[PDB]
Design an enzyme around this catalytic site. Structure first.
Site: not given
Ligand SMILES: CC(C)CC(=O)c1ccc(OC(F)F)c(O[C@@H]2CCOC2)c1
Ligand SMILES: [Mg+2]
Ligand SMILES: [Mg+2]
Ligand SMILES: [Zn+2]
Length: 326
Positions: A75, A115-116, A287, A236, A79, A233, A284
């Site tokens: 983060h 946003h982060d 996810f 990835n 990113h 977001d 992953q």
């Protein structure tokens, strides 16, 4: 000028999924957010449209970028730059041509950039469980996401940083609300409800004579922008594998560091945060299966067939990670 020319070359790929964002971070002198945002603003003619002085833009961007933590593995400013650029590509999808106003486009890109910001490298739940100043300030509700907005907006008021100085009062009001709505929707506790709403929109989808999405009210318009930035977001695993693997390396480092802090406090270690007991590949695959693919499949339906190559890459990457398990 040699490094400068190589950077300029790389930035020519700004309209492409799979931009070499890590290469840009190094070539720019750790200024990927600044150079990518500046490039995108030029590309979209946003400085002229909103009378943004170039020096003000660069000053704000540099300060914003500075407020991302260089010592956080995932983060960080890279990113932010990646989500900005991904949002930029998603905004250009044929199915959305001429759908959004210039102010809505500005809001989405600005929201992506901030946003982060000032992310400490730990989750909302960690901040809640450790009785942090952040969780106390924000009453355990979208703790980080409220903070990112507060920081992103506050930095506009620093010396020569108000990039919106020439917007009308009504424009500033509308942009502020939109940006808040978008960044709060990046809170993963909102994902299931966001996705449910996106599915409903897809099922009741209407298109214009041109074949472009019809959105005729704020609720639908903001929902698409929320899901767009949320997709960015969570983009990835949809990227070329050499990028995706680097992102996975970084999130795992960040997760493991949180787990070490939890271990040192005598807390139970959060899922996927124990470096002594973590299944990176299985995680992953989970996810993708439970979060990323259900979202991106629905996005792909909304803009069908614009996102087919992105969805195909995601499915290839899932298969690849799966293949490492047996
Ligand atoms: C907004 C949220 C999804 C960010 C995040 O936590 C995240 C980003 C990229 C992640 O992985 C990869 F895409 F970099 C990720 O993976 C964790 C580890 C295994 O499954 C969940 C998590
Ligand atoms: Mg910093
Ligand atoms: Mg976030
Ligand atoms: Zn993010």
């Amino acid at each position: 000028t040699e490094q400068e020319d190589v950077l300029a070359k790389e930035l020519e790929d700004v309209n492409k999924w799979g931009l070499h964002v890590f290469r840009i971070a190094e070539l720019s002198g750790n200024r990927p957010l600044t150079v990518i945002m500046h490039t995108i603003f030029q590309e979209r003619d946003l400085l002229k449209t909103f009378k943004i002085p170039v020096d003000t833009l660069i000053t704000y961007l540099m300060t914003l970028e500075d407020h991302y933590h260089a010592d956080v593995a995932y983060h960080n400013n890279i990113h932010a730059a990646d989500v900005v650029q991904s949002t930029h590509v998603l905004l250009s999808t044929p199915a959305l041509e001429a759908v959004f106003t210039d102010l809505e486009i500005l809001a989405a890109i600005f929201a992506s950039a901030i946003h982060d910001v000032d992310h400490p490298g730990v989750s909302n739940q960690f901040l809640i469980n450790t009785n942090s100043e952040l969780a106390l300030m924000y009453n355990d509700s979208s703790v980080l996401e409220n903070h990112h907005l507060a920081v992103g907006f506050k930095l506009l008021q620093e010396e020569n940083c108000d990039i919106f100085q020439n917007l009308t009062k009504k424009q500033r009001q509308s942009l502020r609300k939109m940006v808040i709505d978008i960044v709060l929707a990046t809170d993963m506790s909102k994902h299931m409800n966001l996705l449910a709403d996106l599915k409903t929109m897809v099922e009741t989808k209407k298109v214009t004579s041109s074949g472009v999405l019809l959105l005729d009210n704020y609720s639908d318009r903001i929902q698409v922008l929320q899901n767009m930035v949320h997709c960015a977001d969570l983009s990835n695993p949809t990227k070329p594998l050499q990028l995706y693997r680097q992102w996975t390396d970084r999130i795992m480092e960040e997760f493991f560091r949180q787990g070490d802090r939890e271990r040192e406090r005598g807390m139970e270690i959060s899922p996927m945060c124990d470096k002594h007991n973590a299944s990176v590949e299985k995680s992953q695959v989970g996810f993708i299966d439970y979060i990323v693919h259900p979202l991106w499949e629905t996005w792909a339906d909304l803009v069908h067939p614009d996102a087919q190559d992105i969805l195909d890459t995601l499915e290839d990457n899932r298969e690849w990670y799966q293949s490492t398990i047996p």
